[PDB]
Design an enzyme around this catalytic site. Structure first.
Site, PDB file in Angstrom:
ATOM      1  N   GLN A 189       0.973  -1.123  -0.078  1.00  0.00           N
ATOM      2  CA  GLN A 189      -0.030   0.040  -0.116  1.00  0.00           C
ATOM      3  C   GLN A 189       0.981   1.191   0.018  1.00  0.00           C
ATOM      4  OE1 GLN A 189      -2.894   1.262   3.072  1.00  0.00           O
ATOM      5  NE2 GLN A 189      -3.939   2.471   1.543  1.00  0.00           N
ATOM      6  N   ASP A 232       2.207   1.574  -3.918  1.00  0.00           N
ATOM      7  CA  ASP A 232       1.250   2.017  -4.714  1.00  0.00           C
ATOM      8  C   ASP A 232       0.678   3.455  -4.494  1.00  0.00           C
ATOM      9  OD1 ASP A 232      -2.206   2.444  -4.687  1.00  0.00           O
ATOM     10  OD2 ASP A 232      -1.686   0.904  -6.451  1.00  0.00           O
ATOM     11  N   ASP A 290       3.197   5.865  -3.317  1.00  0.00           N
ATOM     12  CA  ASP A 290       4.263   6.714  -3.511  1.00  0.00           C
ATOM     13  C   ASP A 290       4.365   6.829  -4.984  1.00  0.00           C
ATOM     14  OD1 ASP A 290       7.029   7.408  -4.145  1.00  0.00           O
ATOM     15  OD2 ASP A 290       7.510   6.698  -2.247  1.00  0.00           O
ATOM     16  N   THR A 299       4.705  12.137  -7.690  1.00  0.00           N
ATOM     17  CA  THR A 299       5.885  11.485  -8.519  1.00  0.00           C
ATOM     18  C   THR A 299       6.078  10.194  -8.787  1.00  0.00           C
ATOM     19  OG1 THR A 299       7.842  11.308  -7.269  1.00  0.00           O
ATOM     20  CG2 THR A 299       7.079  13.597  -7.450  1.00  0.00           C
ATOM     21  N   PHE A 342       8.708   8.522  -9.831  1.00  0.00           N
ATOM     22  CA  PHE A 342       9.832   7.740  -9.162  1.00  0.00           C
ATOM     23  C   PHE A 342       9.588   7.392  -7.829  1.00  0.00           C
ATOM     24  CE2 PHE A 342      12.062  10.183 -12.833  1.00  0.00           C
ATOM     25  CZ  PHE A 342      11.296  11.248 -12.808  1.00  0.00           C
ATOM     26  N   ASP A 384      10.334   7.684  -4.545  1.00  0.00           N
ATOM     27  CA  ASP A 384      11.188   8.684  -3.963  1.00  0.00           C
ATOM     28  C   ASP A 384      10.736   9.216  -2.619  1.00  0.00           C
ATOM     29  OD1 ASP A 384       9.194  10.270  -4.407  1.00  0.00           O
ATOM     30  OD2 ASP A 384      10.060  11.559  -5.801  1.00  0.00           O
ATOM     31  N   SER A 436       7.916  10.458  -1.689  1.00  0.00           N
ATOM     32  CA  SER A 436       6.916  11.640  -1.797  1.00  0.00           C
ATOM     33  C   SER A 436       5.716  11.419  -1.010  1.00  0.00           C
ATOM     34  CB  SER A 436       6.540  11.862  -3.128  1.00  0.00           C
ATOM     35  OG  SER A 436       5.839  10.797  -3.722  1.00  0.00           O
ATOM     36  N   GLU A 448      -6.691   6.630   5.635  1.00  0.00           N
ATOM     37  CA  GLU A 448      -7.852   5.610   5.120  1.00  0.00           C
ATOM     38  C   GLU A 448      -7.835   4.374   5.998  1.00  0.00           C
ATOM     39  OE1 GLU A 448      -7.130   1.940   2.777  1.00  0.00           O
ATOM     40  OE2 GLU A 448      -9.181   1.333   2.917  1.00  0.00           O
ATOM     41  N   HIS A 459      -5.659  -5.231  -2.950  1.00  0.00           N
ATOM     42  CA  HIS A 459      -6.922  -5.416  -2.245  1.00  0.00           C
ATOM     43  C   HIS A 459      -7.384  -6.701  -1.861  1.00  0.00           C
ATOM     44  CE1 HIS A 459      -7.912  -1.166  -4.039  1.00  0.00           C
ATOM     45  NE2 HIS A 459      -7.121  -1.121  -3.323  1.00  0.00           N
TER      46      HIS A 459
HETATM   47  C1  HEM Z   1      -6.619  -2.464   4.358  1.00  0.00           C
HETATM   48  C2  HEM Z   1      -6.012  -2.183   3.034  1.00  0.00           C
HETATM   49  C3  HEM Z   1      -6.525  -1.044   1.878  1.00  0.00           C
HETATM   50  C4  HEM Z   1      -7.729  -0.142   2.019  1.00  0.00           C
HETATM   51  C5  HEM Z   1      -8.638  -0.269   3.198  1.00  0.00           C
HETATM   52  C6  HEM Z   1      -7.889   0.348   0.725  1.00  0.00           C
HETATM   53  C7  HEM Z   1      -8.634   1.386   0.111  1.00  0.00           C
HETATM   54  C8  HEM Z   1      -8.684   2.130  -1.219  1.00  0.00           C
HETATM   55  C9  HEM Z   1      -9.460   3.103  -1.782  1.00  0.00           C
HETATM   56  C10 HEM Z   1     -10.749   3.691  -1.113  1.00  0.00           C
HETATM   57  C11 HEM Z   1      -9.131   3.413  -2.823  1.00  0.00           C
HETATM   58  C12 HEM Z   1      -9.739   4.602  -3.810  1.00  0.00           C
HETATM   59  C13 HEM Z   1     -10.352   3.798  -5.138  1.00  0.00           C
HETATM   60  C14 HEM Z   1     -10.926   4.495  -6.454  1.00  0.00           C
HETATM   61  O1  HEM Z   1     -11.800   5.294  -6.147  1.00  0.00           O
HETATM   62  O2  HEM Z   1     -10.758   4.162  -7.489  1.00  0.00           O
HETATM   63  C15 HEM Z   1      -8.005   2.772  -3.140  1.00  0.00           C
HETATM   64  C16 HEM Z   1      -7.176   2.975  -4.135  1.00  0.00           C
HETATM   65  C17 HEM Z   1      -6.078   2.168  -4.505  1.00  0.00           C
HETATM   66  N1  HEM Z   1      -5.562   1.183  -3.785  1.00  0.00           N
HETATM   67 FE1  HEM Z   1      -6.096   0.658  -2.194  1.00  0.00          FE
HETATM   68  N2  HEM Z   1      -6.555   0.241   0.041  1.00  0.00           N
HETATM   69  C18 HEM Z   1      -5.879  -0.908   0.558  1.00  0.00           C
HETATM   70  C19 HEM Z   1      -4.835  -1.446   0.339  1.00  0.00           C
HETATM   71  C20 HEM Z   1      -3.958  -1.562  -0.915  1.00  0.00           C
HETATM   72  C21 HEM Z   1      -2.793  -2.377  -1.020  1.00  0.00           C
HETATM   73  C22 HEM Z   1      -2.472  -3.192   0.017  1.00  0.00           C
HETATM   74  C23 HEM Z   1      -2.671  -1.861  -2.535  1.00  0.00           C
HETATM   75  C24 HEM Z   1      -1.413  -2.389  -3.250  1.00  0.00           C
HETATM   76  C25 HEM Z   1      -0.429  -3.480  -2.973  1.00  0.00           C
HETATM   77  C26 HEM Z   1      -3.430  -0.795  -2.902  1.00  0.00           C
HETATM   78  C27 HEM Z   1      -3.207  -0.224  -4.234  1.00  0.00           C
HETATM   79  C28 HEM Z   1      -4.281   0.559  -4.500  1.00  0.00           C
HETATM   80  C29 HEM Z   1      -4.204   1.320  -5.838  1.00  0.00           C
HETATM   81  C30 HEM Z   1      -3.406   1.154  -6.868  1.00  0.00           C
HETATM   82  C31 HEM Z   1      -5.473   2.477  -5.935  1.00  0.00           C
HETATM   83  C32 HEM Z   1      -5.990   3.604  -6.902  1.00  0.00           C
HETATM   84  C33 HEM Z   1      -4.784   4.459  -6.809  1.00  0.00           C
HETATM   85  C34 HEM Z   1      -4.595   6.051  -7.706  1.00  0.00           C
HETATM   86  O3  HEM Z   1      -4.037   5.571  -8.409  1.00  0.00           O
HETATM   87  O4  HEM Z   1      -4.968   6.958  -6.995  1.00  0.00           O
HETATM   88  N3  HEM Z   1      -4.379  -0.624  -2.099  1.00  0.00           N
HETATM   89  N4  HEM Z   1      -7.586   2.038  -2.021  1.00  0.00           N
HETATM   90  O1  LIG Z   2      -6.923   5.923  -2.411  1.00  0.00           O
HETATM   91  C1  LIG Z   2      -7.060   5.339  -1.075  1.00  0.00           C
HETATM   92  N1  LIG Z   2      -6.249   4.403  -0.778  1.00  0.00           N
HETATM   93  O2  LIG Z   2      -5.067   3.779  -1.093  1.00  0.00           O
HETATM   94  C2  LIG Z   2      -8.237   6.283  -0.387  1.00  0.00           C
HETATM   95  C3  LIG Z   2      -8.822   7.409  -1.251  1.00  0.00           C
HETATM   96  C4  LIG Z   2      -9.941   8.166  -0.921  1.00  0.00           C
HETATM   97  C5  LIG Z   2     -10.442   7.765   0.584  1.00  0.00           C
HETATM   98  C6  LIG Z   2      -9.863   7.004   1.252  1.00  0.00           C
HETATM   99  C7  LIG Z   2      -8.655   6.007   1.040  1.00  0.00           C
HETATM  100 CA   LIG Z   3       6.860   9.496  -5.715  1.00  0.00          CA
END
Ligand code: HEM
Ligand SMILES: O=C(NO)c1ccccc1
Ligand SMILES: [Ca+2]
Ligand SMILES: *[C@@H]1O[C@H](CO)[C@@H](O[C@@H]2O[C@H](CO)[C@@H](O[C@H]3O[C@H](CO)[C@@H](O)[C@H](O)[C@@H]3O)[C@H](O)[C@H]2NC(C)=O)[C@H](O)[C@H]1NC(C)=O
Ligand SMILES: *[C@@H]1O[C@H](CO)[C@@H](O[C@@H]2O[C@H](CO)[C@@H](O[C@H]3O[C@H](CO)[C@@H](O)[C@H](O)[C@@H]3O)[C@H](O)[C@H]2NC(C)=O)[C@H](O)[C@H]1NC(C)=O
Ligand SMILES: *[C@@H]1O[C@H](CO)[C@@H](O[C@@H]2O[C@H](CO)[C@@H](O)[C@H](O)[C@H]2NC(C)=O)[C@H](O)[C@H]1NC(C)=O
Ligand SMILES: *[C@H]1O[C@H](CO)[C@@H](O[C@@H]2O[C@H](CO)[C@@H](O)[C@H](O)[C@H]2NC(C)=O)[C@H](O)[C@H]1NC(C)=O
EC number: 1.11.1.7
Length: 595
Positions: A105, A108, A110, A184, A186, A188, A190, A258, A351
């Site tokens: 998390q 993803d 960073d 960013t 990279f 890094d 951020s 979150e 997820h």
């Molecule tokens: C308890 C663990 C986690 C919770 C509660 C959570 C929650 C969320 C929420 C609410 C979103 C917004 C999605 C959207 O509107 O499209 C999100 C996005 C995302 N999550 Fe998670 N997440 C968790 C774990 C993880 C993990 C462990 C990874 C990767 C190993 C991950 C990768 C991503 C990615 C790539 C996005 C879209 C990001 C973006 O580009 O803005 N998440 N997550």
């Molecule tokens: O993007 C998230 N997690 O990776 C996230 C986004 C909006 C509200 C709560 C959590």
């Molecule tokens: Ca970065």
């Protein structure tokens, strides 16, 4: 010339041509092309976007229109009939700690961030969407199907807004709509420092010239740092608990809060910045706050890259790693380090690794008392548990002794995320991350499943029989088929995570390729990569390969027994050694004299 055009959400200021540090926005990393890698630029497209109307509308906006002759199923149905499951038993990875899910998390985060669009504050566009569910403009509702419990209890739909895009934020019409990455590209750190100048400044303790990051004033962990509270009201961290009113944390990234575990890792990285910053004063006393800020920061970036590339990716890409990430031969100016739009959906595999509850442990790693174990949903945007209920030692012990949820074909996403999710903008634990995810692939105009199958040089099913063989699962393919009418319309998210796993990793062929490619690219294309002949000194380098996440904990918490290999499953006390036996960061090849 190509669409050498747009860039309006873009900041813009200049480059020092021989500077030894990264900018706060990622700019100037690439000399030929400055902006490559920088924050607030469109996400890269490894393939053309696919929209209903060709330029901006997603598939499943106009009911009449089909995708290749068929209707795209509602997202929440794909969620209901495939993702969801009831029984949490035998669902945990026998050889991965909870930390394995968390570190992901952090990365993803960073690398990417697509802010939703927002022009409607103090308008009933937030109400014309949540309350009345009427599609339009940037309101793209997730409608509930028939035979759905939420129907009987929440309404006709879940509100959902389209992700922000480049150039403006208002009506745009000529080239296809590209979404925004707002951090960013990279790796890094951020997420610790921010991706904006505006902000990196507010995170720092400028009042004092030691290069410290600003810490929390109101509270301290048994005499230890806390990310600082955030101004913004109404911050929903006090909504989940109106009696306690504990705001969210202000950090490099906005999502730090979150969930209580991610917020915990953010605190473990902050303290360490200060720990390094103040040790660097001790060894190089004539160094100003800025100098201390940078070299400290510059290191943490290394800690993240190393651990990511050394301890994290090989237990994920598994055997596939070598087929994608050849050893490091040095910076290559011709590589595009940008994050692609698809990677942002490919990394959401994380997820399926989220378990249903979070545990709290005492010193001899035992259930921290009566309510030591809580179900996940009571922790979304939960800061008061950390502040008023133990701090982080109990939680951090948790990430080590506990395990991740194994992704598996019959049980995919826990109910805590698929039925009881809570969003900052609204006030109900009642959203679905699976549905939301599936809609998002469409909002971003993502090409189907078989396109990507082809892109990575993998076969492409056209039939149930073909789909059964690839997925290696008869019932799963059948349901996918009943809903998508063609493997060609299967949203890449569900597409990628349904493939069985590669040997020794935790993701299938397709996804291994997509991820495999992106980290290869962000490594070969980072001028500030830590293994880059120049960035750090030769002695400084050998000093760094001596880091472990196990050490990170010891230096920043009061846990005295940790394991040597934090990512793989480890029981206490056999696999637990005392801190004093863990290799440490020898900060001396840094020690300056004559500066
Ligand atoms: C308890 C663990 C986690 C919770 C509660 C959570 C929650 C969320 C929420 C609410 C979103 C917004 C999605 C959207 O509107 O499209 C999100 C996005 C995302 N999550 Fe998670 N997440 C968790 C774990 C993880 C993990 C462990 C990874 C990767 C190993 C991950 C990768 C991503 C990615 C790539 C996005 C879209 C990001 C973006 O580009 O803005 N998440 N997550
Ligand atoms: O993007 C998230 N997690 O990776 C996230 C986004 C909006 C509200 C709560 C959590
Ligand atoms: Ca970065
Ligand atoms: C919101 O947070 C509240 C505090 O931030 C929390 O209330 C606090 O938690 C319990 C209430 O059950 C009490 O803590 C301890 O004291 C009780 C006796 O009162 C013991 O029996 C328990 O074992 C426990 O260790 C606190 O006294 C209480 N604080 C206050 C000011 O009432 C709420 O539970 C949270 N509410 C929600 C809806 O999440
Ligand atoms: C739990 O998962 C662990 C990682 O998936 C696994 O341990 C790893 O096993 C590999 C074999 O793939 C070993 O390979 C390493 O061998 C030497 C070290 O002695 C190195 O020179 C090589 O680089 C190579 O990586 C490792 O010993 C270990 N992984 C690492 C990164 O060291 C466990 O076997 C799994 N546990 C069970 C019970 O299956
Ligand atoms: C630098 O990195 C780039 C990666 O984008 C390499 O590009 C390759 O160069 C070949 C020419 O031999 C091009 O046809 C391809 O774009 C890339 N190769 C493959 C197999 O796709 C480049 O070769 C690297 N060069 C050096 C010297 O480091
Ligand atoms: C960081 O800058 C200074 C340096 O520590 C902090 O000031 C200290 O504050 C704590 C209590 O709040 C006490 O140790 C002293 O009052 C100060 N000590 C010193 C050496 O200055 C300041 O609190 C921090 N800045 C922020 C924004 O938190």
């Amino acid at each position: 010339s190509w669409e050498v055009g747009c860039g309006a959400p873009v900041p813009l200021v200049k480059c020092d041509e021989n500077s030894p540090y990264r900018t706060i926005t990622g700019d100037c990393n690439n000399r030929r092309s400055p902006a490559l890698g920088a924050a607030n630029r469109a996400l890269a497209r490894w393939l053309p976007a696919e929209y209903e109307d060709g330029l901006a509308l997603p598939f499943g906006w106009t009911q009449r229109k089909t995708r290749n002759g068929f209707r795209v199923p509602l997202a929440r149905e794909v969620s209901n009939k495939i993702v969801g499951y009831l029984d949490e038993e035998g669902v945990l990875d026998q050889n991965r700690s909870l930390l394995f899910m968390q570190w992901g998390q952090i990365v993803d985060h960073d690398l990417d961030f697509a802010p939703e669009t927002e022009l409607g504050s103090n308008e009933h566009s937030k109400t014309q969407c949540e309350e009345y569910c009427i599609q339009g403009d940037n309101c793209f509702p997730i409608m509930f199907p028939k035979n759905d419990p939420k129907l009987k209890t929440q309404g006709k739909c879940m509100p959902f807004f389209r992700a922000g895009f480049v150039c403006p934020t208002p009506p745009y019409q000529s080239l296809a709509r590209e979404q925004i990455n707002a951090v960013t590209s990279f790796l890094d750190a951020s997420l610790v420092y921010g991706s904006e100048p505006s902000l990196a400044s507010r995170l720092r303790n400028l009042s004092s010239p030691l290069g410290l990051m600003a810490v929390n004033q109101e509270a301290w962990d048994h005499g230890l740092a806390y990310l600082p509270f955030n101004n913004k009201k109404p911050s929903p961290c006090e909504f989940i608990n109106t009696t306690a009113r504990v705001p969210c944390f202000l950090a490099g990234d906005f999502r730090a809060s979150e969930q209580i575990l991610l917020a915990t890792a953010h605190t473990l990285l902050l303290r360490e910045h200060n720990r390094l910053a103040r040790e660097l004063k001790k060894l190089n006393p004539h160094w100003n706050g800025e100098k201390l800020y940078q070299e400290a920061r510059k290191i943490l970036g290394a800690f993240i890259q190393i651990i990511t590339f050394r301890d994290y990716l090989p237990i994920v890409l598994g055997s596939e790693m070598q087929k994608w990430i050849p050893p490091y031969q040095g910076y290559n100016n011709s590589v595009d380090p940008r994050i692609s739009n698809v990677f942002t959906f490919a990394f959401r595999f994380g997820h399926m690794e989220v378990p249903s509850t979070v545990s709290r442990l005492d010193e001899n790693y035992q259930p921290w008392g009566p309510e030591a174990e809580l179900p996940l949903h009571t922790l979304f945007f939960n800061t008061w548990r950390i502040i008023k209920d133990g701090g982080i030692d109990p939680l951090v012990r948790g990430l080590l002794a506990k395990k991740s949820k194994l992704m598996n074909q019959d049980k995919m996403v826990t109910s805590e995320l698929r039925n009881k999710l809570f969003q900052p903008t609204h006030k109900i634990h009642g959203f679905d991350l699976a549905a939301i995810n599936l809609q998002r692939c469409r909002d971003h105009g993502m090409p189907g499943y078989n396109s990507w199958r082809g892109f990575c040089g993998l076969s492409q099913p056209k039939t149930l029989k073909g789909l059964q063989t690839v997925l290696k699962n008869k019932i799963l393919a059948k349901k996918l088929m009943d809903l998508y009418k063609t493997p060609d319309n299967i949203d890449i998210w569900i597409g990628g995570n349904a493939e069985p796993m590669v040997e020794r990793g935790r993701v299938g062929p397709l996804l291994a390729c997509l991820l495999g490619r992106q980290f290869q690219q962000i490594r070969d294309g980072d001028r500030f990569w830590w293994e880059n002949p120049g960035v750090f000194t030769e002695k400084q380098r050998d000093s760094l390969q001596k880091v472990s996440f196990s050490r990170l904990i010891c230096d920043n918490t009061h846990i005295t027994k940790v394991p040597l290999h934090a990512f793989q499953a480890n029981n206490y006390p056999h696999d637990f050694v005392d801190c004093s036996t863990v290799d440490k960061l020898d900060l001396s090849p840094w020690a300056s004299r004559e500066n």
